[PDB]
Amino acid sequence: SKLPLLTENGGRVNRVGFTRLSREGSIHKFGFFYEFTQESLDFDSDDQLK
Amino acid sequence: PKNMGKTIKVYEYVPLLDDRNINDQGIDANGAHIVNGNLYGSSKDIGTIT
C-alpha cells in the first residue's frame, strides 16, 4: 500500500521527511567522611588505626 | 614471644560496607543522625541502596 510509486507525469508525489532526536546525561556529586579525636589515635590499642 | 601469656589475639578490621559494622557515628544525607553508620551495609537490594 505505502510503496513509493511513480507515474509518467512525474510531480509532487512521495514526499518524505526526517527527524533528529537527542539524548542527555547529567553529573552528580557524592561524598562522605568520618571524624576522630587525638585522644582516639594517641592512646589507642592499635598503632596504625589511621 | 616468651614472657607473654599462652593466648595470642589478633585484630580484624571490618569494611565500611558490611553488616557487621554496627556503629552509631552516622549522619544521613540531609543531616539528621541515623541508627546505622555502615551506609546500607551489605544489603544487595536496590531500594535501600538508592
Short mmCIF file of C-alpha atoms in Angstrom, two decimals:
data_model
loop_
_atom_site.label_atom_id
_atom_site.label_comp_id
_atom_site.label_asym_id
_atom_site.label_seq_id
_atom_site.Cartn_x
_atom_site.Cartn_y
_atom_site.Cartn_z
CA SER A 1 0.00 0.00 0.00
CA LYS A 2 2.69 2.51 1.02
CA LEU A 3 5.23 1.72 -1.71
CA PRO A 4 6.55 4.85 -3.48
CA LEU A 5 5.06 4.52 -6.96
CA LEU A 6 5.79 7.00 -9.75
CA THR A 7 3.91 7.64 -12.97
CA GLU A 8 4.95 9.22 -16.25
CA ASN A 9 3.54 12.56 -15.10
CA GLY A 10 6.28 12.95 -12.51
CA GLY A 11 5.29 15.59 -9.99
CA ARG A 12 4.91 16.40 -6.30
CA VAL A 13 4.41 12.82 -5.13
CA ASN A 14 6.00 10.68 -2.41
CA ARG A 15 7.45 13.36 -0.12
CA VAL A 16 9.46 12.15 2.88
CA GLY A 17 10.90 14.00 5.86
CA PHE A 18 13.40 13.05 8.54
CA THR A 19 13.61 13.72 12.28
CA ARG A 20 16.53 14.18 14.67
CA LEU A 21 16.25 13.40 18.38
CA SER A 22 18.64 13.95 21.30
CA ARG A 23 19.88 12.05 24.36
CA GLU A 24 21.08 13.70 27.57
CA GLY A 25 23.02 12.76 30.69
CA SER A 26 23.79 14.62 33.90
CA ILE A 27 26.53 14.85 36.54
CA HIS A 28 26.01 14.24 40.26
CA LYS A 29 28.16 14.75 43.36
CA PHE A 30 28.68 12.23 46.18
CA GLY A 31 30.86 12.03 49.28
CA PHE A 32 31.23 11.02 52.93
CA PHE A 33 33.65 11.37 55.84
CA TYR A 34 34.35 10.33 59.43
CA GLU A 35 35.73 12.12 62.49
CA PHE A 36 38.28 11.11 65.12
CA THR A 37 39.91 12.72 68.14
CA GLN A 38 43.58 12.91 69.06
CA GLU A 39 42.58 11.08 72.24
CA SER A 40 41.46 8.26 69.92
CA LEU A 41 44.70 7.92 67.93
CA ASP A 42 47.24 8.78 70.64
CA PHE A 43 46.38 6.28 73.38
CA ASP A 44 44.61 3.55 71.42
CA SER A 45 45.34 -0.17 71.23
CA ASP A 46 46.44 -0.15 67.58
CA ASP A 47 49.33 1.88 66.19
CA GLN A 48 48.09 2.10 62.58
CA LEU A 49 44.39 2.87 63.01
CA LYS A 50 44.62 5.76 60.52
CA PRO B 1 57.49 -14.46 72.24
CA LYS B 2 58.26 -15.61 75.76
CA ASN B 3 57.14 -13.62 78.85
CA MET B 4 53.67 -13.20 77.34
CA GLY B 5 50.68 -15.38 78.11
CA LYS B 6 49.77 -18.60 76.30
CA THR B 7 46.98 -16.84 74.36
CA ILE B 8 47.51 -14.85 71.16
CA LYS B 9 44.86 -12.39 69.98
CA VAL B 10 44.75 -10.72 66.57
CA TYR B 11 42.54 -7.91 65.30
CA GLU B 12 40.15 -7.89 62.34
CA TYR B 13 39.04 -4.68 60.62
CA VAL B 14 35.54 -4.80 59.11
CA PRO B 15 34.76 -2.96 55.85
CA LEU B 16 32.58 0.14 55.85
CA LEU B 17 30.02 -1.62 53.64
CA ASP B 18 29.41 -4.62 55.91
CA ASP B 19 26.53 -5.62 58.16
CA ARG B 20 29.00 -6.28 60.99
CA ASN B 21 29.73 -2.52 61.02
CA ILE B 22 27.22 -1.90 63.81
CA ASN B 23 28.12 1.63 64.91
CA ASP B 24 26.48 4.89 65.98
CA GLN B 25 28.58 7.56 64.25
CA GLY B 26 26.21 8.05 61.33
CA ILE B 27 24.71 11.06 59.54
CA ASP B 28 22.18 10.70 56.75
CA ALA B 29 22.34 12.66 53.51
CA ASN B 30 20.36 15.59 54.94
CA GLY B 31 21.94 15.97 58.38
CA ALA B 32 19.84 14.03 60.88
CA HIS B 33 21.72 11.35 62.77
CA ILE B 34 20.72 7.79 61.89
CA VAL B 35 20.95 4.46 63.69
CA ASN B 36 23.34 2.80 61.26
CA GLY B 37 26.65 4.19 60.06
CA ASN B 38 27.69 1.46 57.63
CA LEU B 39 26.00 3.09 54.61
CA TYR B 40 23.39 0.37 53.88
CA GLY B 41 25.93 -2.30 54.87
CA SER B 42 25.92 -5.33 52.59
CA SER B 43 22.20 -5.35 51.69
CA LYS B 44 22.37 -6.18 47.98
CA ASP B 45 18.95 -4.61 47.32
CA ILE B 46 18.06 -1.68 45.08
CA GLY B 47 15.61 0.24 47.24
CA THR B 48 17.78 0.50 50.34
CA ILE B 49 20.92 1.49 48.44
CA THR B 50 19.06 4.12 46.43
#
